[PDB]
Design an enzyme around this catalytic site. Structure first.
Site, PDB file in Angstrom:
ATOM      1  CG  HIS A  85      34.777  34.961  43.625  1.00 52.77           C
ATOM      2  ND1 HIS A  85      35.575  35.582  42.694  1.00 52.77           N
ATOM      3  CD2 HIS A  85      33.858  35.899  43.990  1.00 52.77           C
ATOM      4  CE1 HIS A  85      35.154  36.824  42.511  1.00 52.77           C
ATOM      5  NE2 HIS A  85      34.111  37.043  43.275  1.00 52.77           N
ATOM      6  CG  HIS A  87      30.794  37.704  44.655  1.00 51.84           C
ATOM      7  ND1 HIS A  87      31.899  38.457  45.021  1.00 51.84           N
ATOM      8  CD2 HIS A  87      30.053  37.540  45.760  1.00 51.84           C
ATOM      9  CE1 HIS A  87      31.886  38.598  46.336  1.00 51.84           C
ATOM     10  NE2 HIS A  87      30.752  38.113  46.798  1.00 51.84           N
ATOM     11  CG  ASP A  89      32.045  39.306  39.486  1.00 53.71           C
ATOM     12  OD1 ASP A  89      31.499  38.892  40.513  1.00 53.71           O
ATOM     13  OD2 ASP A  89      33.171  39.848  39.461  1.00 53.71           O
ATOM     14  CG  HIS A 150      36.996  39.640  45.802  1.00 48.01           C
ATOM     15  ND1 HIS A 150      36.428  40.891  45.795  1.00 48.01           N
ATOM     16  CD2 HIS A 150      36.054  38.795  45.321  1.00 48.01           C
ATOM     17  CE1 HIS A 150      35.207  40.806  45.327  1.00 48.01           C
ATOM     18  NE2 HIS A 150      34.944  39.540  45.022  1.00 48.01           N
ATOM     19  CG  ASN A 181      31.112  44.592  46.317  1.00 49.43           C
ATOM     20  OD1 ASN A 181      31.130  44.489  47.547  1.00 49.43           O
ATOM     21  ND2 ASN A 181      30.028  44.523  45.628  1.00 49.43           N
TER      22      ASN A 181
HETATM   23  C1  YVC Z   1      29.151  41.042  41.692  1.00 46.12           C
HETATM   24  C2  YVC Z   1      30.078  41.576  42.743  1.00 46.12           C
HETATM   25  C3  YVC Z   1      30.265  43.079  42.444  1.00 46.12           C
HETATM   26  C4  YVC Z   1      29.258  44.012  42.225  1.00 46.12           C
HETATM   27  C5  YVC Z   1      29.548  45.346  41.914  1.00 46.12           C
HETATM   28  C6  YVC Z   1      30.874  45.787  41.832  1.00 46.12           C
HETATM   29  C7  YVC Z   1      31.913  44.864  42.065  1.00 46.12           C
HETATM   30  C8  YVC Z   1      33.298  44.978  42.082  1.00 46.12           C
HETATM   31  C9  YVC Z   1      34.141  46.192  41.826  1.00 46.12           C
HETATM   32  C10 YVC Z   1      33.788  47.427  42.328  1.00 46.12           C
HETATM   33  C11 YVC Z   1      34.628  48.521  42.099  1.00 46.12           C
HETATM   34  C12 YVC Z   1      35.820  48.392  41.384  1.00 46.12           C
HETATM   35  C13 YVC Z   1      36.740  49.608  41.153  1.00 46.12           C
HETATM   36  S1  YVC Z   1      37.975  49.814  42.503  1.00 46.12           S
HETATM   37  C14 YVC Z   1      39.004  48.349  42.279  1.00 46.12           C
HETATM   38  O1  YVC Z   1      38.754  51.025  42.330  1.00 46.12           O
HETATM   39  O2  YVC Z   1      37.232  49.763  43.800  1.00 46.12           O
HETATM   40  C15 YVC Z   1      36.142  47.139  40.883  1.00 46.12           C
HETATM   41  F1  YVC Z   1      37.291  46.862  40.179  1.00 46.12           F
HETATM   42  C16 YVC Z   1      35.311  46.062  41.105  1.00 46.12           C
HETATM   43  C17 YVC Z   1      33.757  43.704  42.394  1.00 46.12           C
HETATM   44  C18 YVC Z   1      35.123  43.272  42.682  1.00 46.12           C
HETATM   45  O3  YVC Z   1      35.798  44.023  43.460  1.00 46.12           O
HETATM   46  O4  YVC Z   1      35.431  42.069  42.368  1.00 46.12           O
HETATM   47  N1  YVC Z   1      32.739  42.847  42.529  1.00 46.12           N
HETATM   48  C19 YVC Z   1      31.587  43.541  42.368  1.00 46.12           C
HETATM   49  N2  YVC Z   1      29.648  41.444  44.104  1.00 46.12           N
HETATM   50  C20 YVC Z   1      28.337  41.517  44.670  1.00 46.12           C
HETATM   51  C21 YVC Z   1      28.530  41.410  46.079  1.00 46.12           C
HETATM   52  C22 YVC Z   1      27.341  41.432  47.055  1.00 46.12           C
HETATM   53  N3  YVC Z   1      27.203  40.081  47.609  1.00 46.12           N
HETATM   54  C23 YVC Z   1      27.043  39.895  49.032  1.00 46.12           C
HETATM   55  O5  YVC Z   1      27.041  40.801  49.834  1.00 46.12           O
HETATM   56  C24 YVC Z   1      26.935  38.404  49.345  1.00 46.12           C
HETATM   57  N4  YVC Z   1      26.341  37.683  48.212  1.00 46.12           N
HETATM   58  O6  YVC Z   1      29.909  41.304  46.371  1.00 46.12           O
HETATM   59  C25 YVC Z   1      30.621  41.374  45.146  1.00 46.12           C
HETATM   60  O7  YVC Z   1      31.796  41.391  45.012  1.00 46.12           O
HETATM   61 ZN    ZN Z   2      33.439  38.945  43.855  1.00 46.82          ZN
HETATM   62 ZN    ZN Z   3      34.675  40.738  41.066  1.00 51.01          ZN
END
Ligand code: YVC
Ligand code: ZN
Ligand code: ZN
Length: 232
Positions: A85, A87, A89, A150, A181
């Protein structure tokens, strides 16, 4: 020393590999975002004498470190990469890949979203994935579009030779207590998309989330449960 590596065990900037099955590794790296540090996973799949990479290591320096780790541990060239996707990461590091001779691919949906958000853009478009339930072959994997979860563009990856299901960020680890996120998520559609994954890949033996520890098929049901509770 053998267990799956966790966020506090990986300094930002280094990459670890973990052997999942014969010819299948995950890659694990850590990155800072909005003042907190997070782990993230990708996949490496052996493709004869070459490798297929799934997802970057979340940034340019991490992705350079990934390439160096692959050279040390595996010693076969990465020739293609798919981003699951839009993002950072998943695509952050695509410019490093492209300068190391790797052909980068993503769905047209991912490429449009990456461009609009100012993220790095994979070179090549993957057609045949625009409707939920679509699947295409790409080297030693199948790519599957389950529907919005997601993100609207998220793809999952299956390695048929090993029954490995890489869920990407549409699938959460068993310890998760929230849906990660959710900025670009569809919490209402997500359970339906997970149900499509469960129906399509009932023989999966390993399930790899986008962040955190692999497990078995229970990751899918757990994901549906935490997403339903987050929506509520
Ligand atoms: C890089 C990515 C991102 C940044 C920082 C954190 C994450 C997490 C994350 C957070 C917490 C947990 C623990 S838990 C399951 O207990 O919650 C986890 F496993 C993953 C995930 C995911 O969930 O994939 N992605 C993250 N971005 C940035 C973003 C902002 N982008 C806009 O608004 C539009 N451009 O939107 C995302 O996704
Ligand atoms: Zn993502
Ligand atoms: Zn992610």
């Amino acid at each position: 020393s053998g267990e799956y590596p966790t966020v506090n065990e990986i300094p930002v900037g280094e990459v670890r590999l973990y052997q999942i099955a014969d010819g299948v590794w995950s890659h694990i790296a850590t990155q800072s975002f909005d003042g907190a540090v997070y782990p993230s996973n990708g996949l490496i799949v052996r493709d004869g004498d070459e490798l297929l990479l799934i997802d970057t290591a979340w940034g340019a320096k991490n992705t350079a470190a990934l390439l160096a780790e692959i050279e040390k541990q595996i010693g076969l060239p990465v020739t293609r990469a798919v981003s699951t996707h839009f993002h950072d990461d998943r695509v952050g590091g695509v410019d490093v890949l492209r300068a190391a001779g790797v052909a980068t691919y993503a769905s047209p949906s991912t490429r449009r979203l990456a461009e609009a958000e100012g993220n790095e853009i994979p070179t090549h478009s993957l057609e045949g994935l625009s409707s939920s339930g679509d699947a295409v072959r790409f080297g030693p994997v199948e790519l599957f579009y389950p529907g919005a979860a997601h993100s609207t563009d998220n793809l999952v990856v299956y390695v048929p030779s090993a029954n490995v299901l890489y869920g990407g960020c549409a699938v959460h680890e068993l310890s998760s207590t929230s849906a990660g996120n959710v900025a670009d998520a569809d919490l209402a559609e997500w359970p339906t998309s997970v149900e499509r994954i469960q129906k399509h890949y009932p023989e999966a033996e390993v399930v790899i989330p986008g962040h955190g520890l692999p497990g078995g098929l229970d990751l899918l049901q757990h994901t549906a449960n935490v997403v339903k509770a987050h929506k509520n």
